[PDB]
Amino acid sequence: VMMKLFYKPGACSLSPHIVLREAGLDFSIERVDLVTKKTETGADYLSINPKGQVPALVLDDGSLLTEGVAIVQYLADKVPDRHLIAPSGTLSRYHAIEWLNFIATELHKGFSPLFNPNTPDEYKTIVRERLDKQFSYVDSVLAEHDYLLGKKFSVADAYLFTVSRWANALNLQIKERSHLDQYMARVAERPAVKAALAAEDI
Amino acid sequence: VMMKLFYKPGACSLSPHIVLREAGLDFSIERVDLVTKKTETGADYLSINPKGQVPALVLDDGSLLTEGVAIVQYLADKVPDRHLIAPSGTLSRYHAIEWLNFIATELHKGFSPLFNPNTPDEYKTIVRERLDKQFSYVDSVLAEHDYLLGKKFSVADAYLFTVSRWANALNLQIKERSHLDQYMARVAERPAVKAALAAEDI
Ligand SMILES: N[C@@H](CCC(=O)N[C@@H](CS)C(=O)NCC(=O)O)C(=O)O
Ligand SMILES: N[C@@H](CCC(=O)N[C@@H](CS)C(=O)NCC(=O)O)C(=O)O
Numbered sequence: 296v297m298m299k300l301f302y303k304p305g306a307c308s309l310s311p312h313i314v315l316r317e318a319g320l321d322f323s324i325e326r327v328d329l330v331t332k333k334t335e336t337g338a339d340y341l342s343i344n345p346k347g348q349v350p351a352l353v354l355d356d357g358s359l360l361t362e363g364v365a366i367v368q369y370l371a372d373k374v375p376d377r378h379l380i381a382p383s384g385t386l387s388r389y390h391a392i393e394w395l396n397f398i399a400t401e402l403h404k405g406f407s408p409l410f411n412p413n414t415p416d417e418y419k420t421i422v423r424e425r426l427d428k429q430f431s432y433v434d435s436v437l438a439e440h441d442y443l444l445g446k447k448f449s450v451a452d453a454y455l456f457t458v459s460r461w462a463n464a465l466n467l468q469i470k471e472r473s474h475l476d477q478y479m480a481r482v483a484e485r486p487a488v489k490a491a492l493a494a495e496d497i
Numbered sequence: 498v499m500m501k502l503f504y505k506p507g508a509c510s511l512s513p514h515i516v517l518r519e520a521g522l523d524f525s526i527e528r529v530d531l532v533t534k535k536t537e538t539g540a541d542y543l544s545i546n547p548k549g550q551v552p553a554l555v556l557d558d559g560s561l562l563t564e565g566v567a568i569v570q571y572l573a574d575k576v577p578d579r580h581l582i583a584p585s586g587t588l589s590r591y592h593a594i595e596w597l598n599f600i601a602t603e604l605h606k607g608f609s610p611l612f613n614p615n616t617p618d619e620y621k622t623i624v625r626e627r628l629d630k631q632f633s634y635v636d637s638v639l640a641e642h643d644y645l646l647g648k649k650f651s652v653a654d655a656y657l658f659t660v661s662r663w664a665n666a667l668n669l670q671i672k673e674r675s676h677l678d679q680y681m682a683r684v685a686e687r688p689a690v691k692a693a694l695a696a697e698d699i
Contacts (some may be wrong), residue, residue, distance in 0.1 A: 345634070346599075358588075362602075365595040372586055383585035384574070386560070396601055397548075404606045408620065415617050432548075456585040 298322040299353040301344065303329055304495040305460065307403060308350035308409045311366040312495065313453040316487035318374045324494065363403075367450035379450050391444055394451045401429050402458045409465060423467060430462060430469045437474040441481070448485065456482045500524040501555040503545065505531055507662065509605060510552035513568040514697065515655040518689035526696065535589040545546040565605075566597045569652035582652050588643045593646055596653045603631050604660045611667060625669060632664060632671040643683065650687070658684045 300315060302308035302324055315322050326335040334340055344361055346350040350371070354476045360366055371380035381387030406420045408414045427457055433455070436443065443451045459479055462469065469475065482488060502517060504510035504526055517524050520530055528537040529551055536542055546553040554562045562568050573582035583589030607628050610616040615625075623694070635657070638645065645653045661681055664671065671677065684690060 307559045354588075360591060360595060362595045362598040364598045365591050368594060369591045386556075388563060389567050389571050392570060393562065396564040396598070397565040399598060399602050400606050404602050411623070414620060414621060418615070418617050418620055421615055 296353075296355055296357055300324050301327050301334065301340070301349050301351045301353075302495065303327050303349050304497060305464075306349050307363055307454075307457060309368065309460070309491060309495065310363050310450075310454040310457040312491045313456070313488050314367045314370045314450050315381065315451075316490050317379055317453070317485075318370050318377060319450075320370065320373065356460065363440045363454060364399050367395070367426075367453060368392075371450045376449065381444070381449075387444070390428070391449065391451055394443055395454065398451065398454045398458060402417055402426075402433075402455070405429060406458070406461055406465075407439070426462065426467055428471055430459070430467070430475060431471040432476040433469040434473070437478050448482070452482055453488075456488070500557065502526045502531050503536070503542075503553040503555075503689055504551050504697070505529055507658075507699055509552050509565050509659055511662075511693060511697065512565050512652075512656045512659040513552050513554060513572060514692055514693045515580065516569045516652050517659070518692050519581055519687075520572050520579055521652070522572065522576065563644075565656065566601050569597070569655060570594075572580070575651045580649060583646075589646070593651060594609045596645055597656060600653065600660060604628070604657075607631065608660065608663050612666055615652045627662070629670050629672055632661075632669070632677060633673040636675070636677040637672070640682045644680070650684075654684060658690070667668045 298315070300308065300312060300322060302312055303326065304330070307481065312324065327333075327340050329347075329349070332340040332347055336344075338392075343348050344359060346361060348361070350361070350363055350366055354360055360369060368380060371377075375382065378436050405422070407427050408492070409419055409446045433443070440446055443455055444447050456479065459475065500517075500522065502510065502514060502524060504514055505528065508531075511556060514526065521587075530536075531549075531551070534542040534549055534597045536545075543549055546561060548563060550563070550564075552565050552568055554560060561572055570582060573579075574585070577584065580605070582593050610624050611621055634671055642648045644650050645657050658681065661677065
């Protein structure tokens with residue numbers, strides 16, 4: 296059975312959406328309303344992913360895989376000739392896992408208060424301040440090489456690109472950002488990235 | 498030359514501390530003050546880890562590994578005879594990665610606002626309600642087999658055990674916890690876990 300990605304336009308599921316197109320694998324996509332927990336076909340989303348989140352990926356055996364970090368590694372390992380991630384058993388792969396975790400916990404989850412309407416503006420200010428330093432730090436790494444893990448685009452870039460879009464949408468102040476902005480411009484040119492954004496009607 | 502772990506007692510660094518002992522690897526440990534950013538020996542911690550957090554592992558080549566999720570996988574892969582995680586490329590490995598990410602992003606990072614005095618009280622209430630649901634979800638999974646990933650103890654259990662201790666220290670409300678509680682008692686009886694806790698003076 297063909298892989299299916301459950302997504303919501305602009306959410307963190309854009310990351311494995313980009314990876315799927317970079318990978319060349321066959322897949323379909325299915326949009327989810329995150330409030331109603333219904334998919335675009337009317338189906339009950341909690342019946343599919345009990346965690347009620349995107350992304351979730353239906354594998355070719357019918358089983359479900361959740362968590363962006365797990366999904367992009369699963370995909371990249373499926374197409375080793377495309378080198379979307381360092382091979383397993385290498386120190387480089389542990390560094391990739393390191394950066395994937397940083398993005399997931401410090402960038403991605405860092406945004407959570409900003410997307411909750413019940414969050415008092417005084418705290419949002421504090422939260423934005425922390426993200427400033429986190430992205431500024433990322434900028435300092437992007438000063439040393441073209442992509443996050445080095446000279447080549449990787450699944451970690453798909454994830455970073457995705458959450459960096461949120462920073463832009465929320466007009467996040469970022470102290471050091473000249474390399475980050477140039478990087479965002481570079482990644483945005485990739486045909487797979489553009490195809491992902493179009494398919495999500497962005 | 499042997500591996501060294503930077504840690505603070507009962508912090509998330511307890512997780513790889515446990516894994517090191519479960520793994521039977523030779524290693525030393527070294528404590529870190531998270532305010533002054535000074536190790537127990539004098540050194541500047543920001544020199545060592547610029548993100549200024551524990552855990553951080555010093556590998557044999559002298560290099561540093563950060564992010565607990567990366568550290569525990571590195572250690573597990575080093576001792577396949579101990580079967581502390583499924584081997585790379587297997588579906589079971591992706592489910593372990595999935596759980597590790599859930600623990601890092603949904604449980605671990607969920608605690609951060611609760612320990613921070615700048616968090617508004619009503620945001621803390623929202624966070625507690627979410628952790629109630631997330632731990633209750635974990636509890637329902639633990640009804641199915643002895644440990645988190647199946648019948649065998651794994652690095653995901655070291656991590657889960659570590660963050661669940663915080664739930665207990667805060668007396669967090671968890672609606673379905675009968676399986677979680679039995680699990681916690683079982684894990685706390687493991688010789689490696691006792692030695693970790695004792696070495697950290699807890
Ligand atoms: N730990 C999950 C977090 C996924 C996540 O936060 N998804 C958001 C979209 S950005 C979501 O689905 N929110 C809906 C909800 O939490 O109810 C992962 O890393 O994949
Ligand atoms: N993203 C890191 C988070 C690690 C972390 O938050 N460590 C805490 C201890 S529980 C810490 O060292 N805090 C000190 C600080 O933030 O300055 C990881 O997943 O390993």
